Design a protein around this ligand. Structure first.
Ligand SMILES: [Ca+2]
Lengths: 395, 412, 209, 48
């Protein structure tokens, strides 16, 4: 019956997705890698990539079919995807010690990890005749109305999905499969709003959510915020970095800070949202001339992840970020991109709501905001390897 | 390599026989204007015999399967012909009742020690018997026999699936039979109580892109039958299978190819000829053979025993001015078979021929003139009764001739 | 290690018997140039017996299966020979009526305490009986006995899934019989009330690998 | 999943026993038509 359902669902596909699926059956790894890191380029390459049409039609085919109930999936995942740089056990070893289990449990206590690519999954437990490439097994509960495309292989049937969410691990236990120890993790999907390339859709959402926000502001504070974001945001942030109220207190800027904070506090974000901000080395306590800014050698990336991944963050100033993820000529030289998930109910406002050029879809957050970094990944950008940071805003 | 052999045939005449029996009692009364009373009694008997000319009888054949190849066959499904005189009565593909699950090389289905299986149905579901006509039934009753010929065999081989399990369904040998036959030469070793048939890949010299390795006939034989080498000669298990110790039978094409290749060869040995596609080589080990060095098989003993000279094909000649006498007790030969006696001879200096005398059924005398080198003669005889008089072989001759590798081999 | 043993054989003679009886009444009148009136009445009896020399009788054999190995066989389907004197009358593969679902080592199908099963059809769909000749019927009436030989047995094994799910379909024992027999030695222990047959792997000293 | 309706392989016998085991049967007879129903009933001996 599963084969018949797969045949039925694949019959109604049109041709373009037909050769897309056929090409996926032989070049899975490269297509998956491209789909993982595709939205961090300029507007030119994304339209100019040789695989953009492939990805578009594959995504459409996947999104054609959706499930009406939550259901479970099973797949093997590398522990490196969950910010674990060590090895649980070798591929020839049979057992995992208590120390490695404890370390892996400690690494994933309270964190959320984002998955952003294609993946082959199974609707049944991995019994005999399957492959066990990693010592980590995932029991993932997919939410309602998510894409799921069953396609018949040469002999068996396999299913492909598109990851667009962030998952958290509840419990991990050690199990035995055919005389080898594995780690089984029960994970749940946490929903969030992400506009990877639909910058138009994100802008429309910002309009629909914050166009009337300005009408809720008292005119004096409204004009205050407008003029400040227009001209003096640089000065305010520069004053805030130096801990101005601590060193040289002055009310001419404390009033500005309070007004901006109250304006942001007036209307909070209603739904979980992801924002992309191109950060600089000066933010991370580095300089452009610093040797660690060269992310081409593996040693620099490894040291940066060792000393920064999994730690916290704190910005005394305000944070300006864009809903879209595509690179711009304004921040072309910045090698670090900050990926931030905004929990529902947190303070923040859409600056671009007001008419005119209010910014690059800018979003403001309250001062003294703190973040937790979960994982760090690197993607190629022309002739240099740039770096991506996943962070979660915390109250 | 799977064949089918019939062991006996059973005929079921399709006739209807009936018998009747009755009795009657009567009574009469007449009034003529006189009177009369008549009492009667009766009996009756009857016999009948009805026959259908279209389907006069049914036939049942007891058969066996055997394998002489190198690989097992799973789900053995042969197809056989039944021929009476020149007419094929029917061709039947084996049904579920006559399928052999396993057939290992050298084995038999049903296994040795069990009765043969019955082939007595012709339809797909084993629900219809095999009929014959009235004329065919008359021919059968006249002493004519039915022969069985196997035309093809269907079977499966085993592989490994995505797991470690063996799978045989869907793996048909017919997908590979033609390809294997197209690029290989066939070699058969007859031996005494077991036959072996092999396929050895041969190189095509007309194709520059055929990179398969080249082999001579001797190397092919050694690889195919797992023969070992003792002193440059091949031994199967203990029987010597060197070209001088056996009988070699070819078809016309193979004989022509070997003859053409021999004249351009240096050693001029058959085992040095290059192996080619389509060759058919049959090797037949002799029943009795002696080389006068280490191998002796005859029940009797030759009169002349003088093997102290380094002559012959391999270090022994056993010939002087004396004569050799041997007598086969006729209790060690097949009742009705066409044997052949063979050997090699040489006259280093020209002399008289050798009087070859064979007396098995009809006494025969023949003369052979040895050349400067070694040549073989191979005259024929035939046994009679398994209990008749002995067979005497004598080679009276003069002129200090020479001999080696005397052998007696059966032929069909 | 599965075998079949025959417990008894039953013969069904295929004969047709008829019986008739009639009554007749007559009456005649004659005029000459005299007169005469004649009254007649009679009766008759009849018997008959028809026989077909091609299919003169049907046979039915009662059999059991037994297992002396180490593993169970599922869906036991044996093939048997029926031999009268030196002739194999027929070979039958068991149909759906004669298939044993389970046969554990040391067990019997049908289980101990039940009657043997009847093998009385030869076609695939169990709609055709097993015939014999007139000569074979005469031989049977002369005291000669029919022997039953088992030539092969088909069956399945179970592959256990990680969640304890047994599957037997598509797992044929015939795929392993030749391979096991090729590399093993056979040892049989007979005792008195039960027999045990085993295969133990043996080393080939001619292969360095 | 496409909005289509399929009936092959959807047998009621797989659910008859389960429905009968956990339900009560009620029949209304009226005059022109009969109605039969099963209504789920709670097992008081099972705390779960
Ligand atoms: Ca010699």
């Amino acid at each position: 019956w599963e084969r018949k359902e797969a045949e039925r669902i694949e019959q109604k596909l049109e041709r373009s997705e037909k050769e897309a699926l056929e090409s996926y059956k032989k070049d899975s790894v490269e297509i998956s890698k491209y789909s993982q890191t595709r939205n961090y380029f300029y507007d030119y390459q994304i339209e100019a990539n040789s695989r953009e049409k492939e990805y578009k039609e594959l995504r459409n085919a996947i999104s054609k079919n959706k499930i009406d109930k939550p259901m479970y999936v099973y797949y093997f995942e590398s522990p490196e995807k969950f910010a674990f740089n060590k090895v649980i056990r070798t591929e020839n070893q049979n057992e995992i010690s208590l120390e490695k289990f404890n370390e892996f449990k400690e690494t994933i206590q309270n964190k959320l990890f984002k998955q952003d690519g294609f993946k082959d999954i199974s609707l049944y437990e991995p019994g005999k005749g399957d492959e066990k490439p990693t010592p980590l097994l995932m029991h993932l509960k997919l939410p309602r109305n998510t894409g799921m495309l069953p396609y018949t292989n040469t002999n068996n049937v396999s299913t492909l999905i598109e990851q667009g969410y962030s998952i958290k691990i509840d419990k991990i236990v050690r199990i035995v499969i055919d005389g080898k120890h594995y780690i089984k993790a029960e994970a749940s999907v946490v929903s969030s709003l992400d506009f990877k390339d639909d910058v138009s859709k994100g802008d429309s959402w910002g309009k629909a959510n914050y166009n009337d926000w300005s009408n809720k502001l008292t005119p004096n504070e409204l004009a205050d915020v407008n003029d400040y974001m227009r001209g003096g945001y640089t000065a305010i942030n520069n004053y805030l970095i130096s801990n101005g109220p601590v060193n040289n207190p002055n009310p001419e800027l404390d009033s500005k800070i309070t007004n901006i904070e109250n304006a942001l506090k007036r209307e909070p974000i209603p739904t979980n949202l992801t924002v992309y901000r191109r950060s600089g080395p000066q933010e991370f306590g580095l300089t452009l001339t610093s040797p660690e800014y060269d992310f081409n050698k593996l040693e620099n990336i490894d040291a940066f992840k060792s000393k920064w991944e999994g730690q916290a963050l704190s910005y005394p100033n305000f944070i300006s970020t864009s809903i879209g993820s595509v690179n711009m000529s304004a921040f072309a030289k910045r090698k670090i991109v900050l990926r931030i998930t905004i929990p529902k109910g947190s303070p923040g406002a859409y600056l671009s709501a007001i008419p005119g050029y209010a910014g690059e879809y800018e979003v403001l957050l309250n001062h003294g905001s703190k973040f937790k970094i979960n994982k760090i990944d690197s993607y190629k950008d022309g002739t240099i390897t740039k770096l991506i940071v996943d962070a979660t805003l915390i109250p | 390599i799977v064949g089918v052999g019939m062991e006996k045939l059973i005929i079921s005449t399709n006739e209807h026989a009936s018998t009747d029996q009755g009795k009657t009692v009567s009574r009469a009364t007449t009034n003529s204007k006189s009177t009369a009373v008549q009492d009667s009694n009766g009996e009756s008997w009857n016999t009948g015999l009805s026959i259908n000319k279209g389907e006069s009888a049914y036939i049942n054949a007891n058969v066996r399967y055997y394998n002489t190849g190198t690989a097992p066959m799973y789900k053995v499904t042969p197809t056989t012909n039944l021929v009476l005189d020149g007419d094929t009565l029917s061709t039947i593909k084996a049904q579920e009742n006559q399928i052999g699950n396993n057939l290992s090389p050298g084995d038999t289905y049903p296994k040795k020690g069990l009765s043969p299986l019955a082939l007595n149905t012709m339809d797909q579901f084993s629900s219809r018997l095999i009929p014959i006509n009235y004329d065919q039934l008359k021919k059968l009753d006249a002493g004519k026999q039915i022969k069985l010929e196997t035309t093809q065999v269907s079977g499966n081989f085993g592989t490994k699936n995505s797991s470690g399990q063996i799978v045989t369904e869907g793996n048909s040998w017919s997908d590979y039979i033609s390809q294997i036959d197209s690029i290989s030469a066939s070699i058969i070793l007859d031996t005494e109580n077991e036959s072996y048939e092999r396929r050895v890949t041969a190189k095509n010299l007309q194709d520059p892109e055929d990179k398969t390795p080249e082999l001579t006939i001797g190397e092919a034989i050694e690889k195919a039958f797992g023969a070992t080498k003792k002193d440059g000669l091949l031994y199967f298990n203990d029987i010597p299978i060197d070209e001088s110790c056996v009988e070699l039978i070819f078809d016309d094409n193979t004989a022509n190819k070997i003859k053409d290749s021999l004249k351009t060869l240096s050693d001029k040995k058959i085992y040095n000829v290059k192996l080619e596609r389509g060759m058919n080589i049959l090797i037949k080990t002799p029943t009795y053979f002696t080389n006068f060095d280490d191998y002796n098989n005859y029940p009797s003993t030759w009169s002349n025993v003088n093997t102290t000279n380094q002559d012959g094909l391999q270090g022994s000649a056993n010939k002087l001015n004396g004569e050799t006498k041997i007598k086969i007790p006729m209790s060690e030969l097949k009742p009705y078979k066409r044997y052949v006696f063979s050997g090699y001879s040489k006259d280093p200096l020209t002399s008289n021929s050798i009087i070859v005398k064979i007396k098995a059924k009809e006494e025969k005398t023949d003369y052979l003139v040895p050349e400067q080198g070694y040549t073989k003669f191979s005259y024929e005889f035939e046994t009679t009764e398994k209990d008749s008089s002995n067979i005497e072989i004598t080679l009276i001759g003069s002129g200090t001739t020479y001999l080696d590798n005397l052998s007696i081999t059966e032929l069909n």
